[PDB]
Design a protein around this nucleic acid. Structure first.
Length: 108
RNA sequence: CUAAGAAAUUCACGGCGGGCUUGAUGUCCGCGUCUACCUGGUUCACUGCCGUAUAGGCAG
């Protein structure tokens, strides 16, 4: 996003990822009436942000500086392959640091 | 039909003054190297044999 992605990201991250349901399959799993149970007519005008908080745009696109390539199919024409940069895999391999290069158990 | 396809790093400059590395020392002691072979393979142009053109007396 922009340079304003430090606070709202940590605010949005914790509620969806990290729930604590492991113990029971029967007890306190059939609950649906433990809400606040308020009225629906009182908050009509200024609660306009329930639906637009998630829905970003789609439109699958590439760019003219985006590294596109042709790959020959067996006995046939081509598929145009547009590779992307793996952020998560480079981040996982950036745990080349603490366990291997100059973490504590390695330098010991 | 290629992580495709593109690209000017550049200008200038004082490294420098001085200096005690010393002193001493047991390398010794022993020893069986042997047998055989063809350089009879192409391993520098050493003063006294009348003329490239197809031509002329080599008791080397």
């Amino acid at each position: 996003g922009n340079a304003a992605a430090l606070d709202v990201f940590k605010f949005l991250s914790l509620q969806y990822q990290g729930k604590n349901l492991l113990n029971w399959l029967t007890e306190d799993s059939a609950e649906a009436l433990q809400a606040l149970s308020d009225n629906a007519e009182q908050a009509r005008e200024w609660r306009q942000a329930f639906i637009g908080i998630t829905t970003v745009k789609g439109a699958p696109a590439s760019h003219s500086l985006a590294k596109q390539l042709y790959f020959p199919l067996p006995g046939s024409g081509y598929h145009l392959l547009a590779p992307l940069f793996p952020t998560s895999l480079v981040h996982h391999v950036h745990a080349l640091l603490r366990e291997a290069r100059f973490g504590d158990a390695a330098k010991a």
